[PDB]
């Protein structure tokens, strides 16, 4: 009769189960890692390194818009009804070259370009023309890009998500990189084109093995914004079982700022003056004492949250990373090995 | 001057308060005392759908009431058979993070969306015997929170970029854009006639829209936190909402003001999903505390609980027939209630 319909509807259900089990042996054998953090944290450079060892193209698109924004400003200076007055008595071909890039068939983008505007950026007339060039349909991201010109000038510059927000080259809401360490398989998800309000889409990553929190130590108030974000992540009811691998990234810059000059962390963090380098501190060879104190004071600011709130369900793995570090993959691999073992030992009630 | 513009704004908004307060003469709970309560409403788990690896985020019932699609964060769309529990379709997605799914009223396509900012439409019945991706609607600069089908070529989506959108599936372009929400749009419910539809966002407000013109006809307030779910009353003249303030409210499009509040002091968790009975007499809501309450929509009393889930109840819904109630949860399991 129509019991034949069951034969296909049982055979079809079956020819799905044998692949759903094949999909289970691959899903459970791969660790999922969320790569959170602010844009200038170096998270993007860490990702580039991870892919190369084991989104970047947007740099050219940042460069072209910056060139258009700067050249636009030089033409604007003239367009002003009182054509603005330039503080530099002579352009020296700086402004002239900028003009010479007009409707370039495509811009090679050699360094002289930047050097030319790097100096013209603070020009009294240039700033005044840009302020007027507001009326001359001034670009929204021009001021921001003009401020970052030194950061962009570096050949090894790789744009932050704050930079890719200012430009419009982000279309894909999430970026993936699958890497394998010691034959183990890891899936890292760099959240792309999403708004700054995370209280809804952060609940999707409640089952990842670890959230990688990349932080900029040299930015000490960005650093306080990274501490309130960590605190809300650590205290969320849905992320209460998710471990957090903490990456205090910009170690080289933290060291220069602290050793070279006095930007007092004491200004923006008062209790640093009453802080002593810990006894379990392991300063590396040649590591100056204050920086070896600056590293652990910023590290203990996050550990204060994870201890005051952590009830024994989620753990925190701080690392004094640097974005170029080749060991970052291994650091993540060893922390995921520790997370899985602590989960098994809690099932047996051995911990 | 922003100050003058934001001052005429209170001059304009305060008058709406008195227009609704003047219309208030007798509470709905005050006019329903000549009728009897419905008593305790017990329901049982008839089926239990298994096969999803990760948590279940969304489920849309079929008008046929024979199939239903489920979206799970492990990158899988699964269409079930609520009578035989057999897996009809298994769709391997190219982006595991999905947050919604829809049952097209024609059964030829299914919808889904999530963190990839791309609404994917899959052709269930192509004339060679393989499901594959029919169309990818690109736009919306944010997560897709809810998508509902209009026909085989029109679909309304809601996103985390605080907007809604109408699409064209053949070309790929976006037809309409609904702007006005200041927070992430969470849920949407099409009206019976599909002339209107309501949307609840993270701004603690419900907005009544017009798919035809594109302007916000009405804006409903009274909730205290993000509205996570919204559904139309069957007669089309009302709608209920579920917020993070542990409260459900029954508004009314005609009177433009709230009519009933469904809350309990023992209830302190946010509502994740809402649905009405086929007669609209029972308001069913999914909660964060793993339970599902059965409210008397006419007397604001409680009349039953659907307590069979181990993790957070993410989705809810009644069949077009009006008997089965499906519940998804973060425990990877679906349940049919009756």
């Amino acid at each position, epitope marked *: 009769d129509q019991r034949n319909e069951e034969k296909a509807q049982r055979e079809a259900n079956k020819k799905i189960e044998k692949q759903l089990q094949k999909d289970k042996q691959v899903y459970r054998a791969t660790h999922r890692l969320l790569l959170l953090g602010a844009g200038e944290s170096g998270k993007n450079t860490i990702v580039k390194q991870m892919r190369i060892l084991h989104k970047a193209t947007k740099v050219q698109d940042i460069k072209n818009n910056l060139k258009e924004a700067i050249e636009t400003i030089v033409a604007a200076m003239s367009n002003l009804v009182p054509p603005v007055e330039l503080a530099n008595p002579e352009n020296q071909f700086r402004v002239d070259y900028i003009l010479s890039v007009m409707n370039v068939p495509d811009f090679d983008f050699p360094p002289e370009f930047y050097e030319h505007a790097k100096a013209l950026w603070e020009d009294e007339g240039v700033r005044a023309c840009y302020e007027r060039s507001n009326e001359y349909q001034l670009i929204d991201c021009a001021q921001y890009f003009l401020d970052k010109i030194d950061v962009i000038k570096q050949a090894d510059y790789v744009p932050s998500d704050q930079d890719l927000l200012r430009c419009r080259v982000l279309t894909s809401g999430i970026f993936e990189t699958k890497f394998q360490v010691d034959k183990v398989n890891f899936h890292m998800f760099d959240v792309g084109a999403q708004r700054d*309000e995370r209280r809804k889409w952060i609940q999707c990553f409640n089952d990842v093995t670890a959230i990688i929190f990349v932080v900029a130590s040299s930015s000490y108030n960005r650093l306080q914004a990274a501490l309130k974000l960590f605190d809300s992540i650590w205290n969320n009811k849905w992320l209460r079982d998710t471990s957090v691998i903490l990456f205090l990234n910009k170690q080289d810059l933290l060291a220069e700022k602290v050793l070279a000059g006095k930007s007092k962390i004491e200004d923006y963090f008062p209790e640093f003056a009453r802080y002593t380098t810990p006894e379990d501190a392991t300063p590396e060879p040649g590591e100056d004492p204050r920086v070896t104190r600056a590293k652990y004071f910023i590290r203990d600011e996050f550990l204060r949250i994870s201890t005051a709130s952590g009830d024994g369900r989620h753990y925190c793995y701080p690392h004094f990373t640097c974005a170029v570090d080749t060991e970052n993959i291994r650091r993540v691999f060893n922390d995921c090995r520790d997370i899985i073992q602590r989960m098994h030992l809690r099932q047996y009630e051995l911990l | 001057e922003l100050d003058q513009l934001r001052q005429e704004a209170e001059q304009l908004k305060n008058q709406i308060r008195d227009a609704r307060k003047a219309c208030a003469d007798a509470t709905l709970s005050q006019i329903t005392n000549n009728i009897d309560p419905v008593g305790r409403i017990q329901m049982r788990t008839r089926r239990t759908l298994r096969g999803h690896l990760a948590k279940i985020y969304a489920m849309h019932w079929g008008t046929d009431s024979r199939l239903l699609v489920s979206a799970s964060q492990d990158g899988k769309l699964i269409i079930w058979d609520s009578y035989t529990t057999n897996k009809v379709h298994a769709i391997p997605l190219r982006s595991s993070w999905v947050m919604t799914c829809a049952y097209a009223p024609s059964g030829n396509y299914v919808a889904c969306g999530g963190l990839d900012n791309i609404c994917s439409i899959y052709n269930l019945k192509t004339r060679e015997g393989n499901v594959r991706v029919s169309r990818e609607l690109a736009g919306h600069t944010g997560y897709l929170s809810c998508c509902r089908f209009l026909d085989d070529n029109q679909i309304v989506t809601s996103s985390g970029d605080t907007t809604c959108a109408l699409w064209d599936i053949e070309t790929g372009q976006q037809t309409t854009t609904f702007t006005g929400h200041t927070g992430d749009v969470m849920s949407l419910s099409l009206a019976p006639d599909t002339r209107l539809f309501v949307s609840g966002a993270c701004d*603690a407000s419900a907005k009544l829209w017009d798919v035809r013109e594109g302007m916000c006809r009405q804006t409903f307030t009274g909730h205290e936190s993000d509205i996570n779910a919204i559904c139309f009353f069957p007669n089309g003249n009302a709608f209920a909402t579920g917020s993070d303030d542990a409260t459900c409210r029954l508004f009314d499009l005609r009177a433009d003001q709230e009519l009933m509040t469904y809350s309990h002091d023992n209830i302190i968790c946010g509502i994740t999903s809402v649905s009405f009975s086929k007669s609209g007499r029972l308001l069913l809501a999914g909660y964060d505390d793993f339970n599902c309450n059965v409210w008397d929509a006419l007397k604001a009393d409680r009349a039953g609980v659907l307590a069979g889930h181990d993790n957070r109840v993410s989705c809810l819904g009644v069949t077009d027939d009006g008997m089965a109630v499906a519940t998804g949860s973060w425990d990877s399991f679906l349940k049919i209630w009756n």
Partner: nanobody
Amino acid sequence: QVQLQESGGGLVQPGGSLRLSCAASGFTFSNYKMNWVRQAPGKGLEWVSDISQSGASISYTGSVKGRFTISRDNAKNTLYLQMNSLKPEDTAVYYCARCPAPFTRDCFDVTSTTYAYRGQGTQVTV
């Protein structure tokens, strides 16, 4: 509906004091955590302080401790920010922000560019 109205502020001399008030309506004040946020001219939003539902837990940023003090009267739905020893660096629009969900331990997006449960603010110039 959820409405937060901030009062007080204006131009003041350095080393002075200021009393900022935030009148709430449209929600149960005793169920939510409160915050104070500011936006310096030419800079993003920065979290200033926060107080719990009852007040038994208070926090401040690393540049206002000892000077600012935040209090709330749950019986009258009011949030205060008593400011003292003001510097020309604390000049900004000060917003009264509410935590998204009630009975919650975290507040995720109180300093985002677009956040609903936040007043129009009051300008404080030093």
